[PDB]
Design a protein around this nucleic acid. Structure first.
Lengths: 149, 114
RNA sequence: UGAUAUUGAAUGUUGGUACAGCUUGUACAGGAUAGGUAGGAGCCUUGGAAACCGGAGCGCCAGCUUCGGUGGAGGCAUCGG
RNA sequence: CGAAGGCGACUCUCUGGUCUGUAACUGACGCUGAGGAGCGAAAGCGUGGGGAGCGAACAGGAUUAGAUACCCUGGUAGUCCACGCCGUAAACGAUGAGUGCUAAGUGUUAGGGGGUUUCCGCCCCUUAGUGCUGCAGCUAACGCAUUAAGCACUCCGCCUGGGGAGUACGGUCGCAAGACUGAAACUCAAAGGAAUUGACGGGGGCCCGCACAAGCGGUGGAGCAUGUGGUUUAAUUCGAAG
RNA sequence: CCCGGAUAGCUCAGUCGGUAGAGCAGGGGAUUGAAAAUCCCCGUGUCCUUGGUUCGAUUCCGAGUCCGGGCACCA
């Protein structure tokens, strides 16, 4: 065994980033890039419009209200159900934020995910949001289980 | 007031910390169940980290600065009060490991698997 | 078992009043920390103000309160919000 | 250190044996020993004393399908003392007591003798228990090896396949509990001894696979296709069954 | 005659005028080769009703049920 990393593709046509294409690899139902890309670029045009800002500065500032600090791993001794505080790697802040974005985005419920994802980011930019408490409750799981390390 | 000593008892369950007078008169005390470590979390070094600070807050209420720490019992909190109470701005002067050592005493109870 | 006290002599002690002293009074808005009624545009300082420091204490922990020590002639009220 | 069971605070009183040093003495006075005698942890017994911990029985709370158990907080007798009795245990070195003899090496407890040295010390010789690794030989193998299970000898006990059984009966002994002496009818062809290769372990150590964790997507709901079940019929052809 | 209990589903607390608080339960979360017991999260409440003081006031008086502890009338 040992550590094994995987590869990733750099560019973006619009919002010329690296992490945005990782979100393009998210919500890829059944092997559809452009069908998710059609959802994506129509959303950020609203995000640029509905809030009069550049959508990049809206995007990662919303991520900072999603990117957690502590995971929780476990420990079974009998039936005690112990937990372990885990420092979140700078790898995992990029990854687990996307899961807590897109899962709660498609689960809210509006017309299209052009509208679900756009208002979700404003619910994390202005951090009053349903998926933001998913970050917060893990800290509540971390604050109780802090005593172990 | 100005001076006092600090008793700490760190058993296998509890980390009981009292701040008393030099000539044995109590001022403030707390432990893990005083904070709310309800289960068998009471023996963790994080518990004695939290419990020593709360008792030290009552010392700031009475303004005493000098301490004299006597550790009593086998556990894990004998390092934590050194880490806590020195960081609490209080003067830790002497550290004793006063466990009450019996010579022969009375006979202990049975081993747990007999 | 208690009152009476044959039965006083003190010492403390905690309640009660007879007394008095003497603290507390924002929901926000707000300059803020606005109980109400009456008088009311005034008071106050070398018989010490603005400001600084210390103490007691309170705080709906913001700040208020009072006292002491410095200081140097200044504050505060209606009005206004 | 005591013969064994056993005895660890301290001091005193009283008392047993042990080992060295020789040589003064005795002149074989010795060894072992059936019955007999006395000792013999812990439990238990009878009478009072004392009962802080601890703690069978029991009680309670959990645990669990059950918990008359392990855990849990209490908790009676007990343990403790004087005195009397029971006289058993893996009362073990699983090795009956004594006498001599048979390579070493090595510590360690108490001595003694010497070699330079007051020394401290080092070295060597030497009695006595005390442990370990070791030759010959003994051993069925593990092991045992100057502390023998080596080679010899004197004495005492014990065994003759396993279960039935340390039971029944008979007797002694005891305050009782039960101890000691101690069978038989019956029944199996074997029960055990060390050793080896294995397989297993809610035993350990290393280490691996989508095994697990970290993810994605489904099966179990819904219709429908299909496959065996069962059931159903004239027969629902037979086979495959973690 | 006095004193005791009127809230969240329930058991219960709780201010000197400005508001919803624990425990158990409900709902889910993770945890765990499963299981409770734990560990978090929101939940849901005209603080009994009616008037009054007042700027409105569980808050707090003006007006009353029903359960327990008693002194004591009862021809």
């Amino acid at each position: 065994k040992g550590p094994v990393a995987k590869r990733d593709v750099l560019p973006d046509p619009i919002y010329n980033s690296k992490l945005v294409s990782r979100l393009i690899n998210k919500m890829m139902i059944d092997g559809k890039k452009g069908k998710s890309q059609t959802i994506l670029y129509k959303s950020f045009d609203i995000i640029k419009e509905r809030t009069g800002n550049d959508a990049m500065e809206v995007f990662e500032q919303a991520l900072k209200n999603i990117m957690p600090v502590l995971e929780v791993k476990a420990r079974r001794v009998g039936g005690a159900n112990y937990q372990v505080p885990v420092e979140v790697r700078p790898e995992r802040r990029t990854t687990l934020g996307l899961r807590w974005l897109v899962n709660y985005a498609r689960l809210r419920g509006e017309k299209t995910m052009e509208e679900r994802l756009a208002n979700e980011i404003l619910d994390a930019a202005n951090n009053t949001g349903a998926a933001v408490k998913k970050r917060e409750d893990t800290h509540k799981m971390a604050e109780a289980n802090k005593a172990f390390a | 007031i100005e001076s006092g000593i600090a008793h700490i008892r760190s058993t296998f369950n509890n980390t009981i910390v009292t701040i008393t007078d030099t000539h044995g008169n109590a001022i403030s005390w707390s432990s893990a169940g005083a904070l709310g470590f309800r289960g068998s979390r009471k023996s963790t070094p994080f518990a004695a980290q939290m419990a020593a600070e709360t008792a030290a807050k009552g010392s700031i209420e009475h303004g005493l600065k000098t301490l004299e720490v006597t550790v009593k019992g086998p556990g894990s909190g004998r390092e934590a009060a050194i880490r806590a109470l020195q960081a609490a701005g209080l003067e830790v002067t002497a550290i004793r490991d006063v466990t009450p050592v019996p010579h022969n005493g009375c006979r202990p109870p049975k081993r747990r698997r007999v």
